[PDB]
Amino acid sequence: SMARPVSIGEAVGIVAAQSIGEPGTQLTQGLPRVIELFEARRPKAKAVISEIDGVVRIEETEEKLSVFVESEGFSKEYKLPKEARLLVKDGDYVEAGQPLTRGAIDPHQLLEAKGPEAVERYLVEEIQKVYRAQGVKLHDKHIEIVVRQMMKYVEVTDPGDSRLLEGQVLEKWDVEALNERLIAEGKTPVAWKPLLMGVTKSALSTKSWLSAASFQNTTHVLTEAAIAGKKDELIGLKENVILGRLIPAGTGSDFVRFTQVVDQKTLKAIEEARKEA
Amino acid sequence: KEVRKVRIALASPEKIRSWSYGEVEKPETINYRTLKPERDGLFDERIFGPIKDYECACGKYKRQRFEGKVCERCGVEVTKSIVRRYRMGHIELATPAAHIWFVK
Amino acid sequence: ITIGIDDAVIPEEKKQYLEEADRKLLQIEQAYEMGFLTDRERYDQILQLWTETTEKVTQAVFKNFEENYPFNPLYVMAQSGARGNPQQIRQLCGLRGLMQKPSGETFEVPVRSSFREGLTVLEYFISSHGARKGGADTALRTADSGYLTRKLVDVTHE
Amino acid sequence: MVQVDGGRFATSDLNDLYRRLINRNNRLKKLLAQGAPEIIIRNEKRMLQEAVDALLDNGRRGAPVTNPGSDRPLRSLTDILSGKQGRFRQNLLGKRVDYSGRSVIVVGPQLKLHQCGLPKRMALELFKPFLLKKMEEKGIAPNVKAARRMLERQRDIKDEVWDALEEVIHGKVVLLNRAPTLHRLGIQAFQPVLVEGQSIQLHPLVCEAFNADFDGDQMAVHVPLSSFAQAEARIQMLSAHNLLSPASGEPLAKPSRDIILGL
Amino acid sequence: MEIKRFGRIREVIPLPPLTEIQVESYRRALQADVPPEKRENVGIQAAFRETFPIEELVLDFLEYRLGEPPFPQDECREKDLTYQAPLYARLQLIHKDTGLIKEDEVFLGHIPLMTEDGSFIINGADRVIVSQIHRSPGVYFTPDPARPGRYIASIIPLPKRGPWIDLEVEPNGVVSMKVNKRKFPLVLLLRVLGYDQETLARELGAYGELVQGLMDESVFAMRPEEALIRLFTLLRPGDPPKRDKAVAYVYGLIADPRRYDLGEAGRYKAEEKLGIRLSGRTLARFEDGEFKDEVFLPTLRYLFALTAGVPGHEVDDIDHLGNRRIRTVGELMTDQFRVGLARLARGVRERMLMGSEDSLTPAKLVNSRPLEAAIREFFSRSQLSQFKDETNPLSSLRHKRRISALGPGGLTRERAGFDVRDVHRTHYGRICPVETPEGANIGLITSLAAYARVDELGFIRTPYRRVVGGVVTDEVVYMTATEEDRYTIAQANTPLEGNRIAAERVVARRKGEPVIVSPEEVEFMDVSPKQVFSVNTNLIPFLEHDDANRALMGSNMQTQAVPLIRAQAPVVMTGLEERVVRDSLAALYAEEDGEVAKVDGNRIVVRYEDGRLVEYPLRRFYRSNQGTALDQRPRVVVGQRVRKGDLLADGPASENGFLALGQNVLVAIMPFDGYNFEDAIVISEELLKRDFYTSIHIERYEIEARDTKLGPERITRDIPHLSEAALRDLDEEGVVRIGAEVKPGDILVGRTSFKGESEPTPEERLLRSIFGEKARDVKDTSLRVPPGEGGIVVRTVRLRRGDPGVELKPGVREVVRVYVAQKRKLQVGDKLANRHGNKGVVAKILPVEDMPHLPDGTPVDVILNPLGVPSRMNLGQILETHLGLAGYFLGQRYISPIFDGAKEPEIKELLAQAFEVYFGKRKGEGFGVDKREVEVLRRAEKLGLVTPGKTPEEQLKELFLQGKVVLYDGRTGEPIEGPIVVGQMFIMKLYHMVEDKMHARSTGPYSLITQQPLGGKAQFGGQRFGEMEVWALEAYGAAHTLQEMLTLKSDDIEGRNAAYEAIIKGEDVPEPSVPESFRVLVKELQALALDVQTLDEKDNPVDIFEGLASK
Amino acid sequence: AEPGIDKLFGMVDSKYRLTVVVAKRAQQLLRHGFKNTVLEPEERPKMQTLEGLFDDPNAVTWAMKELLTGRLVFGENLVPEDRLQKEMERLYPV
Ligand SMILES: [Mg+2]
Ligand SMILES: [Zn+2]
């Protein structure tokens, strides 16, 4: 909206959510498919992709369609029903992540196969496919923002030398900071696994107890407020609104919250009165 | 100054009594005939301060000239009445009870 | 810029295209009489035929407007992009096309007329289905859209 | 617990909860003071835990206790905090507001882009305190009270008060708004110009940005108060400085139906 | 004047009584006329038959009778009561043993009575009941969703008369009964109803694949009563399974006609479906203690025959109109009455077990409270009991003929799908496909079609002519959808040569499908195209050139019209504009022939041919439900004969028996200086000069005076600190005198209130003691005008406690109600429409000389944007405009019926004659062509509009036949650069205006609870501020605006007080420190035994209260 | 549009810094009632009435004009604000 490098301290995420949800009132697969891709749940036409590279060796019995992805030493076999409209042929060497039949992809399979990055690229591609199919122009930037927010949470596989526990969930930043401190503390770093979770769960599992307390399931998350014994940091916006505080954005950003102004002449007089002492 | 972090934690009965200006005893809020808040009740002004500014309920001072001194003839001191907003009492139980949230 | 009823000009190729559609429908039913095809593919070919003739008469309307009346206000509104799609201009001059059932299956008989030539009662009773569907879809759509925006801004709020 | 005009007391149920707790508590103090048989001691402690439960949350265990002669349950502390009408959700997200107004809209073609029309009644009823201060700052009324009770009568509206009103709005800015606001252009800033009638005039080139048309759509109008809020409005939220979509960067103040038609 | 007609279709039947559904249903439900021995088993009579006797010493029922209202209808609505009659019942408490027959005539409360027109008067409010559609009872078959080759057999009784019945196929081959969300076998019930392996294999042996799958002999081991104990353990686990308890229980659920009933219509549908004939309307027959057969084995055979693919066995669509039935008002009050009777039945069953068994009058055996409370609750707070709308006569008519699916026993807004909103294949001629509200209520709320009648069974019947050979008859039979489903009905537009059909290959619906048929197989024919749509939709002329969307909006918008004080009938009508005025029960018509005797503005005396001298009073200046003037202007003069049915007096929104909603205004279609942009409409000052679009609205106010324990309230001419200069309009008792105008805030009723005891501020008390205005024992409770309103007081009403037939809530001494009217003209910012849905708000009134004008100097009055047309596909307004042009230049009105009306060449003929009578006339005074029209003519022939080479006169003729004439802008004199279309159009004025919309607030009152500013535009407050607006503000990041929005302009106290103080001090408003919401949240959290530690960045515990209320 | 707004964006790198600059400057000019300006009489924001021409009462116009001149040094931590306030009150009282 200004055709220029963005000013420091602007709140991207609210603009992002508004720009995403604005033309959703002009959608007739449509809005449930959009919700599905935001929920990352179990799809309907659950296609099967490759997981280990190798050639495709189809096997067509009249009642069963099987396929064999065949590496130098790994023949992984998949068994498909007859209605599965394929994407490949026999004698085709395909990559992991690449799908075999038509239909959408569950994202957890792609998380297993190709890590988080192709997951993010696939989600961006799907949402842009829907929105360009309906004829609505939208920069991918906001979708990138929210999907980066979606992949934030990580799982503690094994704690190692840490104070924390296994199977524990946290932010990627915290495990990264504590791991680089651990290798700066002579102790072993923690092993963490990247963990895709749904959008409502992504808002649910946050550390800022005020925002999630106010948010929803307010009874038991208020019992979580009773649980807490923690401190808050007032990083987001919702907590500053609910406490009525000056929000930390725009004019309220701490980069510009204390910018002095003065004239020339009386500034010079004050500085001269300073330097004479 | 200014606030930067907010820490939520448990309670403790000593700090409960630290916040409590006193004790509440009567099951009456205010009157119905006279509409007066009764003494040592829920709306008792000698706990939670007066309703109007710089006045005691006996009538010793009606002016800004004094501040904070407790007029003994009613029990309310001389102040701004908005300390009604920020003031708690307590009730000492005869037997301890469970904050039911940790139960429920 | 005014609108007259004579501005909705009907090109004469409409009925000739309809004659070709009539004799092709005749031939399709004749091939069904010998059992030379199923009724399924008959339905499919009929949908195909009506769709192709619909596109043809839309092209005929637009080249007629560009030929004879370039300052006709309806075609001016169309090319300017201020108001109007080509399909609305076809419904005002050519034929409405085909509508479908509440099951979504398309009727095997199209609306032969525009709005300018009037409609038979049955055609109005047909097109009411799609009109009701569109209104119901919008009235369903609004609140769920606001709901989506709510969840999104709740998760990205920082 | 306050007195309504009908004699009733608009009363929080917490007062009733505190009363029942104080009653049962001092009763059991008196009961232990004498050395009662233990059965009623156990029953009274049972009622004590029940009462303090109801105070913390009427509506967890068993029947949520009501008043005698009422089916409706009470409102506990959890009912105060949580819920759609609680503190956390409600009392900071979604409220009412002073210094506001509501009307219907109508096109005004002759305006510039950063202007909007205000009915004289509405601008009178909105900028009242500034008008009071300026009327005292002129020789029209000595204090605020004379100016107040001389604006009390609509016969007294001379022409000088209109001159003061058009003085005090010089460079002031108001906010236009239409429910429901999808994106951030749903609220705009505008400089006001006084007009006649009982309707808010509007520039054409912004109505499609509002996704608003003149089929009878209503409108809300607010006014910032602090000079900080004035600058916050006049730099960012002014319509003349907002031309491109934050969505994808296209001119939302593009021309429209009749304009494109004429060109 | 000339009233031309059109159309080539002559109908054979007229329209029925339009409101006959409501009044006919209730009049059937009452039977208040008939002697009691002929009261058939229906409604109140049927309910009294079924719920009696009481069985516990036995009391049974003889008959009932209806009393009389103590007050007439206008008196009842004056005193704000319920128009009702008491109901009395002749009763015989008969002990079987001692033969004591205590006979009495008990009193059983009141029953609300219908008005003449079909409304109800409840507490003075005008209400109405809307019919409720639902699924019909009986038996149905649906495809099983889980097992695709299988089906589910459903049996559904009357609503609230027991649960449904699900016959299901288990995965093995046995079939099972699912009742009360529970599965259990079916051979169990066969054994209970006496069906061994013998009978099952003997009759159902054709398909043993599920009958031997059904076979099991362990149930044939146990007898029906042991099977009954077994199923009592099954369906009621954790219960003592006595045989007597089991017999009584499953009799009460299966063979009880008192708590269970299959629908009589559902019984008829089952009898038609299975071909069998039922004895009763229950599931079993309680005989010999056991039960005997009703309909178990034909349904099982149908289920297996459909399972085996036998022809003549078909699943049934639940949304098909042969399977859904309507419930009128009479069924609803019958069922509510049945609920109240069952309540009093169990009440007296309680009461029968107490008391001395001899000294019992039956009057002292029954209460009347629960039944009267049931009926009163149903008429007051139920969902179907709508507050009846009376904006115009047509709106009341449409609200009378509404049809819902919502309410009790229906559907909720969450669980609403799409097919419930969809138009079925068989709505043709039974439900209007286009008349419905939009929004969330779309597809559910609707109205009846025009020629549609309802049977006693609840099925919509529809008229059709028979066709015999190639001859259509003149009789006509009503049918349902089911009887329509076995024929081939041609359309009504098909040409006829006498009764011989003129066409060759007809279009027809076979099973609702379009098909080209020979004339021989035509069995039936539609009556008229008017049988398709509703009465609102049948008003819109040229419906065959408008999209369904704008037709929907126009058909709904006609209800929101407002009656005008100089109203007009439209110049283009559809013929139906008199039957609606006749059956609306608004205007006044002559019953008998005779002569007009006395004409006055309040009453009409007529000498009849009988010689009975009859005077009708005239309801004059009547306030509507929504503040609309209603009156009956007279229409005749003394010394003038009448006929049976002539118009005597003009009702509201009517003219000479024709419907009159808007005005016929000249209008051209062109964009004008941006004022037409996005649907805004421009007018001239000529309309306001000749009082066009002017309305009258009566606003009613109210004030109660009651008894206060702090000293009761009194109403007088004196209140603390009132100048008499602000009081010169009251009477001596206190109310204003009739005739005075009033501005906002001025006193209507001066009411005292005896003061309590509290504290005023010392400075203003010092002001009162220094100025010279002391206080009294009382304080003010005066009724003043809410702001923005105002006008003339017309009528006052002063009720009191101590008057005959006044019934008030306790405490009230007296109440005052004041009627204030105002005459609203047309200003900027009001909302107009015409019949094709092209609506919009008016934008800019202009002086008349700016407006364009015809060559004769006649100016146009309304301007319309053209660009709202082609994205809407509503072309009918253009044909309306052409016809209105012809009718303007010839002075004549026209009738074009729906789908059979004036096409193009007839309009071309009429425009040719109109061009003659215009241009030859203006030529007749020696005024030829102008230069300006010559220039625009040759510019027009550069656009292919007229063929060139002609004289200007013939080209002008061609343009007039096109419906475009030249024009001259009044602002600048030169012609417009193209020919413009222009003609007359019928244009209404909508109900809502800015007066109950526009309000604004600086400061003022606050919440007595939450310290917020007030809410609602009636109560002076400010706007709702939704959270999406907060999101927009954060997207701009204007932070201080948000913080001052959350406290300073809202429920903060000290901040807003300091802000107002600084503004009247004239500086910048400062910034608050600790948040008010922050502080109260901290104290709420500390109330929850939870310490909250407000920190700085360096863990120093910062106080936010400054030690104010902390030790 | 406010005049020179593109050149005003040319001055400060961040628009929010510009906003808080003009807000604080307007607050100063209101608290010392326009006698502590940097402008000239011809640089004063005029306002045309039926009586004539007068100085504008809206401080924000003055602040934008002053920032368009270039006599206002701004930034962060040029001086502690308290001594600025004391010597501003001392040099420029009411
Ligand atoms: Mg609208
Ligand atoms: Zn007291």
Q: Which of D1, D21, D57 sits opposite B91 (nearest CB)?
A: D21
Instruction: Give the burial string for E825-836 (b: 16+ CB within 10 Å, else e).
Output: ebebbbbbbbbb
Reading the block at residue E738, the tokens are: 């009739």
For residue F26, give the chain E residue with the closest CA.
E1068
The set of residues, in sequence order, having a beta carbon less than 8 Å from that of A129 and lying 6+ positions away, is none
Q: Residue E830: its chain D contacts at CB < 8 A?
A: none
Distances (CA, A) of D31 to A239, B40, B46, B95: 48, 21, 29, 12
Nearest in space to E575 (alpha carbons), one of E544, E642, E636, E529:
E529
CA–CA distances in Å: residue E337 to residues E65, E377, F79:
15, 11, 86
E469 and E397, same domain (yes or no): no
| Cβ atoms A133, A151 nearer than 8 A | no
Which ligand number lies closest to the CA of residue D211? 1
Q: Residue A69 belongs to what domain range?
A: 47-103
Q: Which residues contact C67 (CB under 8 A, 6 or more apart)?
A: none
Q: Which of residues 37-76 of B touch E (CB under 8 A)?
A: 48-49, 51-52, 62
Q: Are the C-beta atoms of E768 and E732 separated by less than 8 Å?
A: no
Residues E154 and E270 in one domain: yes
- Find chain E residues with C-beta within 8 A of D92's C-beta: 1046, 1077
Q: Does C16 contact E at CB distance below 8 Å? A: no
Long-range contacts, E287-295 (Cβ 8 Å, 24+): E289/E247, E290/E192, E290/E194, E290/E224, E290/E225, E291/E192, E291/E193, E291/E250, E291/E251, E291/E254, E291/E255, E292/E193, E292/E194, E293/E193, E295/E139, E295/E270
Residues D236 and D176 in one domain: yes
CA atoms of D169 and D256, how far apart (whole Å): 31
- Reported as type and span, the H/E element at residue E630 is strand E629-630
What's the token pair of residue E505? 């290959």
Q: How far is CA A27 from the centre of its chain?
A: 24
**Residues in a beta bridge with E822:** E697
What is the secondary structure of E415-481 as a DSSP string?
T--STTTSPPTT-TTTB-SS----GGGTTTSEEB-SS-EE-SSS-EEEEEEEEETTEEEEEEEEE-H
At residue D152, what is the residue type? E
- How far CA E215 is from CA of E202, E220, E299, in Å, comes to 12, 10, 18
Whole-angstrom distance, CA of residue B24 vs CA of residue D23: 11
Mutate to test the interface with E, among F15, F19, F60 (most CBs of E within 10 A): F19
Q: Which residue of D has its CA nearest to F60?
A: D231
CATH assignment at residue A176:
3.30.60.280
E strand map for E825-963: 831-834, 840-846, 862-864, 892-895
Which chains border B (3 or more CB–CB pairs < 8 Å)? Answer: A, D, E
| D152 lies in the same domain as D190 | no
Give the helix/strand (H/E) hosting E783.
Answer: strand E783-784
E419 with E503, same domain: the answer is no
Alpha carbons E464 and E13: distance in angstroms, whole number: 10
Parent domain of D176: 96-118+172-241
Distance (Å) from CA E842 to ligand 1 centroid: 14
Which chains lie within 8 Å of chain D at 3 or more CB pairs, if any? A, B, C, E, F
Nearest to F15 among D171, D234, D235 (CB): D235
**In this complex, which of B11, B35, B86 lies closest to E1091 when CB atoms are compared?**
B11
- Count A/E contacts: CB-CB distance under 8 Å: 59
Whether residues D111 and D195 share a domain: the answer is yes
Q: Where is the domain boundary, E536, E553, E586?
A: E586
Question: C39-68 vs C13-33: helix axis angle to the nearest 10?
Answer: 170
E1083 vs B88: CB contact, 8 Å cut-off? Answer: yes
E12 touches chain A (CB under 8 A): no
- CA of E980 from ligand 1 middle (Å) equals 29
Domain that holds residue C99: 2-118
DSSP state of F2: -
- Three-state secondary structure call for residue F11: helix
Cβ–Cβ of D172/F49 closer than 8 Å?
no
SS3 of residue E184 by DSSP: strand
E795 assigned to some structural domain: yes
Domain CATH number, residue F42? 3.90.940.10
Token pair listed for E1038: 């204007």
Residue with tokens 């099972």: E176
The gap from C-alpha E557 to its chain's centroid, in whole angstroms, comes to 13
Of C80, C146, C149, the CB nearest to D261: C80
Q: How far apart are the first and last CA of chain D?
A: 67
Host domain of residue E599? 587-651
Backbone dihedral angles phi then psi of residue B97, each to the nearest 5 degrees: -135, 155
Selection from B103, C124, C31 nearest residue E549 by Cα: C124
How many B-E residue pairs are in contact by the CB < 8 A criterion?
A: 80
User: Does E1029 reside within a domain?
Assistant: no
Q: What is the CATH number of the domain that holds A273?
A: 6.10.250.1410
Verify whether the Cβ–Cβ distance E1093 to B85 is below 8 Å: no
For chain A, the chains sharing at least 3 beta-carbon pairs closer than 8 angstroms are B, C, D, E, F
The reply to whether omega before E53 is within 30° of 0 (cis) is: yes
* Among the listed residues F21, F79, F23, the one whose alpha carbon sits nearest the alpha carbon of residue A269: F79
Which residues are paired to F54 by β-bridges? F47
Q: Ligand 1: distance of its center to the CA of D180 in Å?
A: 11
Helix (H) or strand (E) holding F54: strand F53-55
DSSP H or E stretch at residue E695? strand E695-706
Read off the CATH number of the domain in which C114 is found.
1.10.132.30
User: How far is residue E629's CA from residue E564's CA, in Å, rounded to a whole number?
Assistant: 9
| E512 touches C at CB < 8 Å | no
Assess contact for E665 and E564: CB atoms under 8 A.
no
Ligand 1 center–CA D207 separation, angstroms? 11
Q: What one-character DSSP code corresponds to residue A16?
A: H
The first and second tokens of residue E202, run together, are: 């003997």
**Contact in structure between D20 and D51 (CB atoms under 8 Å):** yes
Is E1067 touching F (CB cutoff 8 A)?
yes
DSSP E17: P
Contact D15, D26 (CB under 8 A): no
Q: Amino acid letter at E379?
A: F
Q: Which domain holds residue F4?
A: 1-94
Burial of E1106 (0-12, 13-18, 19+ CB in 10 A): exposed
E855 and E976 assigned to the same domain: yes
Chain D interface, Cβ < 8 Å to B? 1, 3, 15, 18-19, 21-23, 25-26, 28-29, 32, 45, 48-49, 52-53, 56-57, 60-61
Chain F nearest C-alpha distance from E1067 (Å): 7
Q: How far apart are CA A100 and CA A94, in angstroms?
A: 9
Exposure letters E482-520 (e unless 16+ CB within 10 A, then b): ebbeebbbbbbbbebeeeebeeeebbbbeeeebeebebe
Same domain, D106 and D129: no
In contact, E440 and C123? CB cutoff 8 Å: no
Q: What is the CATH number of the domain that holds E806?
A: 2.40.50.150
User: DSSP letter string over E54-111?
Assistant: B---EEEEEEEEE---SS-HHHHHHTT---EEEEEEEEEEE-TTT--EEEEEEEEEEE
Residue E388 lies in a domain: yes
The span from the CA of E496 to the CA of E505, in Å, is 13
Two tokens, residue E115: 């008005």
How long, in residues, is chain A? 277
CATH of the domain at D160: 1.10.40.90
Residue A174 phi, psi (nearest 5) = -75, -40
**Number of domains forming the structure of chain F:** 1
Look-up: residue for tokens 């007080």?
A: E1057
Place of tokens 């219509």: E265
Contact between chains at E1067 and F31 (C-beta distance less than 8 A): yes
Measured distance CA(E648)–CA(E1015) in Å, rounded: 48
Can you spell out the DSSP letters for chain D?
A: -EE-TTS-EE--HHHHHHHHHHHHHHHHHHHHHHT--HHHHHHHHHHHHHHHHHHHHTTSSSS--B-TT--SB---HHHHHSSTTSTTTTTTSSEE-SSEEEEEEEE-SSS-TTEEEEEHHHHHHHSHHHHHHHHHHTTT-SSHHHHHHHHSSGGG--SHHHHHHHHHTTT--EEEE-SS--SGGGEEEEEEEEESSSSEEE-GGGTTTTT--TTT-EEEEE---SHHHHHHIIIIIBGGG--B-TTT--BTT---HHHHHH-
- Annotation-wise, does D213 bind a ligand? yes
CB within 8 Å: A234 and B101? no
Do chains B and C have 3 or more beta-carbon pairs under 8 angstroms?
A: no
C73-80 and C39-68 helices, crossing angle to 10°: 110
* CATH code for the domain of E645: 2.40.50.100
Number of domains in chain E: 6
E553 CB-near residues (< 8 Å, 6+ apart): E438, E837, E839
Q: Which ligand lies nearest the alpha carbon of B75?
A: 2
- Tell whether E56 and E120 lie within a shared domain: yes
- Cβ within 8 Å, pair C77-D182: no
Q: E1087 vs chain B: nearest CA distance in angstroms?
A: 8
CA of E761 from ligand 2 middle (Å) equals 21
**Using an 8 Å Cβ cutoff, are C111 and C130 in contact?**
no
E441 and E538, same domain (yes or no)? yes
List the structure tokens of E530. 């008017």
Binding site feature residues of B for Zn(2+): 56, 58, 71, 74
Q: How far is the CA of B71 from the centre of ligand 2 (A)?
A: 14
Nearest ligand, CA D214:
1
Give the distance, in angstroms, between the CA of residue E39 and the centroid of all CA atoms in the same chain. 33
Chains touching F (3+ CB pairs < 8 Å): A, D, E
B38: nearest Cα among B52, B54, B19, B57: B57
Contact yes or no for D131/E1063 (Cβ under 8 A): no
- Is residue E1028 within 8 Å of D181, Cβ to Cβ? yes
Chain C to chain E, count of Cβ pairs less than 8 Å apart? 140
